[PDB]
Amino acid sequence: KASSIELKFDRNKGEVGDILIGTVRINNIKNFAGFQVNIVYDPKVLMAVDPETGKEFTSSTFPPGRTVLKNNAYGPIQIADNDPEKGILNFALAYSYIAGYKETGVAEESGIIAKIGFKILQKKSTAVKFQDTLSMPGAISGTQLFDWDGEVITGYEVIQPDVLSL
Amino acid sequence: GYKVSGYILPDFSFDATVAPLVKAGFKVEIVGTELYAVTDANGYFEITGVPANASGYTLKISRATYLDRVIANVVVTGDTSVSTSQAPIMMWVGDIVKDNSINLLDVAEVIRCFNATKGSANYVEELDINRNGAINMQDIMIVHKHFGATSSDYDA
Ligand SMILES: [Ca+2]
Ligand SMILES: [Ca+2]
Numbered sequence: 611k612a613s614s615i616e617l618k619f620d621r622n623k624g625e626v627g628d629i630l631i632g633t634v635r636i637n638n639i640k641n642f643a644g645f646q647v648n649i650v651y652d653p654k655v656l657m658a659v660d661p662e663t664g665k666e667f668t669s670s671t672f673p674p675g676r677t678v679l680k681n682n683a684y685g686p687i688q689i690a691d692n693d694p695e696k697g698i699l700n701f702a703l704a705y706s707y708i709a710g711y712k713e714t715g716v717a718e719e720s721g722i723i724a725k726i727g728f729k730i731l732q733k734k735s736t737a738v739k740f741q742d743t744l745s746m747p748g749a750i751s752g753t754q755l756f757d758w759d760g761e762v763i764t765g766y767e768v769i770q771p772d773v774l775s776l
Numbered sequence: 777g778y779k780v781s782g783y784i785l786p787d788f789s790f791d792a793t794v795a796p797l798v799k800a801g802f803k804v805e806i807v808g809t810e811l812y813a814v815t816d817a818n819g820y821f822e823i824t825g826v827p828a829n830a831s832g833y834t835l836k837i838s839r840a841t842y843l844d845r846v847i848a849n850v851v852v853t854g855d856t857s858v859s860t861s862q863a864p865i866m867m868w869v870g871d872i873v874k875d876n877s878i879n880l881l882d883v884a885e886v887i888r889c890f891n892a893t894k895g896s897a898n899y900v901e902e903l904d905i906n907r908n909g910a911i912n913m914q915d916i917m918i919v920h921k922h923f924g925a926t927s928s929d930y931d932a
């Protein structure tokens with residue numbers, strides 16, 4: 611099937627104070643073992659928040675809700691380096707012991723890698739999406755995926771969401 | 777004396793512009809002697825004036841941020857190519873906090889400079905593993921290639 615990473619929202623409309631949930635997932639990524647993404651939004655329209663608790667995202671907040679790369683036997687490592695004030699989310703996650711992971715002979719190729727809450731501050735048309743950044747040269751529209759050999763994966767689609775109209 | 781030569785190649789992907797930077801600097805020394813050499817931009821090294829030794833010598837390869845490698849039984853009965861361009865000696869990067877072990881402390885050092893770009897206050901070239909101008913997850917994944925390894929993990 612089609613290999614891709616996508617950001618999608620549970621709802622397209624809402625009231626001020628409502629928390630829209632953006633789910634980031636991957637589909638059919640061969641030998642997937644890690645990633646890093648850069649997502650941008652308009653901070654005066656939406657506010658990045660934990661989809662569950664509702665706590666405000668800070669520079670070190672790592673998004674929850676993933677269904678892949680959770681096996682402690684391969685030491686998953688999470689990294690967050692956001693800039694909420696500028697409407698920028700940048701985080702990464704990967705198994706450290708990829709050699710052990712490859713030994714199982716079965717990779718986790720489809721699933722959720724992040725769930726992000728976006729609280730509606732204004733009733734206006736806005737968009738959020740993956741976007742390239744200087745700290746990720748050679749990236750695919752602000753995304754980089756890696757296999758269990760530690761190499762960058764290429765050729766997949768980056769499906770942009772939004773068109774959030776209100 | 778004879779000439780002991782070969783080629784060395786780091787175990788990760790890199791483009792043509794950085795090749796000269798990542799293939800140079802590997803110190804090759806014959807254990808128990810004062811004979812040694814450092815690879816040039818082509819990953820090539822050549823030690824000269826080496827006495828014959830039917831009972832092969834032991835060589836040690838080292839470089840900052842890399843895991844030391846020991847190669848025993850290098851027989852020298854004349855000029856000898858330890859390795860070739862076609863089949864070079866591989867070296868593993870990731871032993872940042874020198875302790876002969878690729879572990880979480882090493883990954884933590886790269887993390888301290890996460891997302892740093894060339895010329896930035898937090899950018900350190902040696903931590904920019906593939907030297908593409910930014911320190912990020914791509915570099916960490918390279919270190920992960922040999923997470924948990926010690927010198928003895930190299931093929932003997
Ligand atoms: Ca170390
Ligand atoms: Ca880099």
